[PDB]
Design an enzyme around this catalytic site. Structure first.
Site, PDB file in Angstrom:
ATOM      1  CG  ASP A   1      -8.803  52.867   2.589  1.00 21.79           C
ATOM      2  OD1 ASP A   1      -8.846  52.010   3.014  1.00 21.79           O
ATOM      3  OD2 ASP A   1      -9.128  53.346   1.453  1.00 21.79           O
TER       4      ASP A   1
ATOM      5  CB  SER B   1     -10.826  34.205   8.358  1.00 27.62           C
ATOM      6  OG  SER B   1     -11.803  33.850   9.378  1.00 27.62           O
TER       7      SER B   1
END
EC number: 3.4.23.22
Length: 330
Positions: free
Chosen positions: A35, A199
């Site tokens: 994770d 992004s």
């Protein structure tokens, strides 16, 4: 040193991936959920409330000659999905794919929430975010990667998750045969303890690319892709009959639909998520309403590049003094 381990979807939807981890002496092998959005290595154990164990493999520290109780240490975690767990702490030897760390903090669960009990395939979590998020008190503990990184050939790990198929986690090296083209690196902020990056934009299907900054986290422990409501609405508008359902808890779509791809930007590069990766199947057995793999982050507080996005790429988690993320197509 290096390590390499195969990671395997837990079910036919790729809801999560499990990777075998050797703990203790002699080894006890548990299948953990790696994770990148958390920083505790915790396991079902011989100390876990018996009614809260239902098929998981447990760690028994009393059977490990290298286990030592970390005196006074406790831990307690709550995850973004509302699940939680807590317990005490041992140090022990932990190996992943041939890479061994001695003195790793292994957090032994005394209590786990129902969603963990109900998932017999996941024996615990191995956190790979920054150690500043580790919950052990009164002395915070280091992640497996933090403990291993000085010994690694290069201070990196890579995630290569499969679509409906096994993939690979590598530690200490970049497998240049595992991706196509080049790897595009992008800056990371560690201010919140996550692999947080920006992004450069998105496209829906064959549509034009929209240049816009989208801050979010690369999180292998989250199944879906959670993005701003504007972006998610633009995606689902291209699917006839798709709608946001408050009763189901997100966007649903007719199972008869063919889904468009979704592209996200990494610098000047582009990662394409095929439409099929966005189908999470019937909302309940036999239903013709299917659950979408792109959902709004509006109620989370952060955008999350979860497995839906990451499995379309070869992803480099570069843990150099100034960390960075790398993405390549594959």
């Amino acid at each position: 040193s290096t390590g390499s381990a195969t990671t395997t979807p837990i079910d036919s939807l790729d809801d999560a991936y499990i990777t075998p981890v050797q703990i203790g002496t002699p080894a006890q092998t548990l299948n953990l959920d790696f994770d990148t959005g958390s920083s505790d290595l915790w396991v079902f154990s011989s100390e876990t409330t018996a009614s809260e164990v239902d098929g998981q493999t447990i760690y028994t520290p009393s059977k490990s000659t290298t286990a030592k109780l970390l005196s006074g240490a406790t831990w307690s975690i709550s995850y973004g999905d509302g699940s939680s767990s807590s317990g005490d702490v041992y140090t022990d030897t932990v190996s992943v794919g041939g890479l061994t760390v001695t003195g790793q903090a292994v957090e032994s669960a005394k209590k786990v929430s129902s969603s963990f009990t109900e998932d017999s395939t996941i024996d615990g979590l191995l956190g790979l975010a920054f150690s500043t998020l580790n919950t052990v008190s009164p002395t915070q503990q280091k992640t497996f990667f933090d403990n291993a990184k000085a010994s690694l050939d290069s201070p990196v790990f890579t995630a290569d998750l499969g679509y409906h198929a096994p993939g690979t986690y590598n530690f200490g090296f970049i497998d240049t045969t595992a991706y196509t083209g080049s790897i595009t690196y992008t800056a990371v902020s560690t201010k919140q303890g996550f692999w947080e990056w920006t992004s450069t934009g998105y496209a829906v299907g064959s549509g034009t690319f929209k240049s816009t900054s989208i801050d979010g986290i690369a999180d292998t422990g989250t199944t879906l892709l959670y993005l701003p409501a504007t972006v998610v609405s633009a995606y689902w508008a291209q699917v006839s009959g798709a709608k946001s359902s408050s009763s189901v808890g997100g966007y649903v779509f007719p199972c008869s639909a063919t889904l468009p791809s979704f592209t996200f930007g990494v610098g000047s590069a582009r990662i394409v998520i095929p439409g099929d990766y966005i189908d999470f199947g019937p909302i309940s057995t036999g239903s013709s309403s299917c659950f979408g793999g792109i959902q709004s982050s509006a109620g989370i507080g952060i955008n999350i590049f979860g497995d839906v996005a990451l499995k379309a790429a070869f992803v480099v988690f570069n843990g150099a003094t100034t960390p960075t993320l790398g993405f390549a197509s594959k």
